[model samples]
Target: YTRVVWCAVGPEEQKKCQQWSQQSGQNVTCATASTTDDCIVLVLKGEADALNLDGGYIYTAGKCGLVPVLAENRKSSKHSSLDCVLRPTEGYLAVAVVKKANEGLTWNSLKDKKSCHTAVDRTAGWNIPMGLIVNQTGSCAFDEFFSQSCAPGADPKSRLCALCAGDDQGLDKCVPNSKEKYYGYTGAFRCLAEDVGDVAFVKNDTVWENTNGESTADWAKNLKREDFRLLCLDGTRKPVTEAQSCHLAVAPNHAVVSRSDRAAHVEQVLLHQQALFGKNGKNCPDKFCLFKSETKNLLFNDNTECLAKLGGRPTYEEYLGTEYVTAIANLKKCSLEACAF
Candidate 1:
């Protein structure tokens, strides 16, 4: 439903930012018309999402940033509809396209629904610019966006509209295609990163258990068990948050090994830690040695003690615990039988 790009002409950091933005898809196109007047009709007909698009629409690397100004012309006698006027936000711009789709159409035809249904040609219609949008702001601000815009007036699922207004081909450039099939859906950051990895997805869900569903403690504290830290590609590890997930390199020892076909499968390996210790390098300490009568004692030099000491509440230095715990839990539950031991 969308396509996005970063202008290479921006600052040096924009190069990497462009690469990250492209992670969503290949080239993103902005739709335009021969004249602003024609652009108005096309946009109202859902044929165009952008007009008089300037090159200022640079990519911030990762986000749908630009907030465009829109206007509807009611004075015209022949046409009276809302139109998108490109008042792209500073340093960024976006074009949202919405094609009417499947207006109450269903495979199973119901007796009472025939008139309400669309004919063969009118079978599908686009839901107004609801769910998908590709713009310049980092998706990092999604929480604030939805809290401000969606809850007040829209449905989350219906809000997935796409902003495709930068490339050369317009709608032809933004429509879903075979490449997306081999790759994945270009739905939005949320759907795009649903299965990519925790970091890619940008957030996580914590289990806040309550009969009435009211929370007492912070969601993380009450809902999650403490875990170990993760070491990133650059060797930095941070604790998991509702908005972020850690990615750990796959340990050398695992059921799967690096190969030509699965070379980048780095997340497969993770450490399962006890309340006091965990598997550091060679071997892990006995759980009892780490946590004696509910107290944690850290003996770093000793692998056993380090493992024990490493476990427990996460700390600034002990970041990445959530990543390790999640991976360990998943590995153990992969078959749901038992570890070989």
Candidate 2:
């Protein structure tokens, strides 16, 4: 009778959740949700138990009474630690990038410039930058700030898609789904490289990977790291690699959120499942693979090496840290009515 409701964005996550339930031998079961908002609603309505969510959604969910039970502890060749999930630290820094030739462009005077964003509500692309702009301008009419934008998740008819080139046939121009040609981190960077937008809102690694031929896409294949620069918050520009010293804001890592009453139960189930299908687990390639996803971040972020202890269930403000909470609060004030996807 212990079912852990697992919110899934698509069929891939739904199927994986089913597999996990089957493997758990009735100790747990999986429930499905279509979006982050739906997941939160279901948890509150007593239909679902938990879901993995981005940092942006975590704040909204916290306001609704859900609590953070686990943190997605990512691992890579440069960094590895079981204790990393215990505390918040410097996360991927969101930055504004423009071609080096655009000497006059700075964080202060981005008005009337064409812009690109990873997606609506995303931490780096939408929330951080838009939040700052909203705080400064006190307006929700973002269309007035930038002459045009290619924010994939915005309303299709809105001017936000004015610069979007769309997918292969030019079809899902402003769609939030992968069907849009210019979406997500890589797509937003591609938008700038193609001259579709004057500025791209994305993480620093985007500039690092795409500009150095690490990406073989036709648009990025010829990109040179020297051609781009980061617009600092202090109205100066620097090379992309120095985001640690100069950037808009550092975002918090994503995590697993659930209803407060079910925190201990969900944590127990997740820990047990991790021991089986997590990285280096016995069921990784045998029974099922929990760490692998067919699509980018279906059930959980694909890059997650493991789900580690969160120390204890922390309140939203405590988990997100004061700096991030303040930034998100600014965003809420600006886009209070038209925000969330």
Candidate 3:
């Protein structure tokens, strides 16, 4: 027999499949009170064995140990008030569902329903899969699985419906298409970490790092500009200050640069700056070319009023205390060319 586990995202009894696990003859375990952070799915050999909750816990063969059903209803160490299935032999077998209020469903609920099968339905919600049953407006219940109905947003049909994993760069708006352009929030400073999908670039100030020791993509320890643009201030005078400096306004391209005053932008400046840093064009070859970077009096003020007018609110307070920076996942930064518009 296989085992399965789940962490309470909300009151289990309130969920659609609240009693399926206990009735299926699968044992439940409890994690320490701290598995609330960095929770993600981990597919074990075959059975769902572990979960990362408070201190962590594991699954026993059968009726392993007493797990807490409710914090207030605690009895003994074997039966504490908490939610989590734990096991030391297995690490994180699946994602954590800590928020017990609005959390849709736990991974364990899905696994147990499928007998610990290793497949992402990508179309299941509660206990129903997408395209199965028909409801009002001719909507199929099967679509519910692939559809994130409970997740409210502009376009609920988008794939972004799945919540970002723990410690993920969440709430940062993004386009679900080829034009993954960076949209500034509360300010116009291009957030490299958010835009380029690299937290290390902004935090360590370096860009190059062999993450997981893979030599595929080139990361940096510091900003090595590939292009840039000069920001003008006061009608027709050269602006001087970081406030006046603007990076390339366009995304990476191979199109020939037209020799004209209007075409010059921040991207060109970054390309030129990189070349000046002593890096030859051959070292960083492409079917095209871009501008470079330089340190001077330059600040970005790209018509904040204009962006705001264009239905874009890219302005935030200049200072907001401290922000934590970390490394980005390979999936986010997988293909640079794919990322560029």
Q: Best by TM-score, which number?
A: 2
**TM-score-sorted candidate list, best first:** 2, 3, 1
Model 2 ranges off by over 4 Å: 11-34, 75-89, 100-104, 138-140, 164-181, 208-224, 285-295, 336-341
* Predictions: Cα RMSD each: 27.0, 4.0, 27.3
**Per-residue lDDT of 153-268 in model 2, one digit per residue for the tens?**
67777788898876678876776544577776777888899888999998876787676777666788899988998999898999877888888887777788998989888998
TM-score of each: 0.15, 0.80, 0.17
Q: What stretches of model 1 exceed 4 Å from their correct place?
A: 1-200, 203-233, 241-341
The ten-residue window of minimal lDDT in model 2 covers 81-90
Q: For this target, which candidate reaches the highest lDDT against the unseen true structure?
A: 2
Full-model lDDT, candidate 1: 0.20
Model 1 Cα lDDT, one tens digit per residue, 232-319 = 3232443333113332221110011111122122111111212213232222232222212111001111112111111132221122
What Cα-based lDDT does every candidate model obtain?
0.20, 0.76, 0.19
Residue 84 lDDT (model 2): 43
For model 3, what is the alpha-carbon lDDT of residue 93?
10
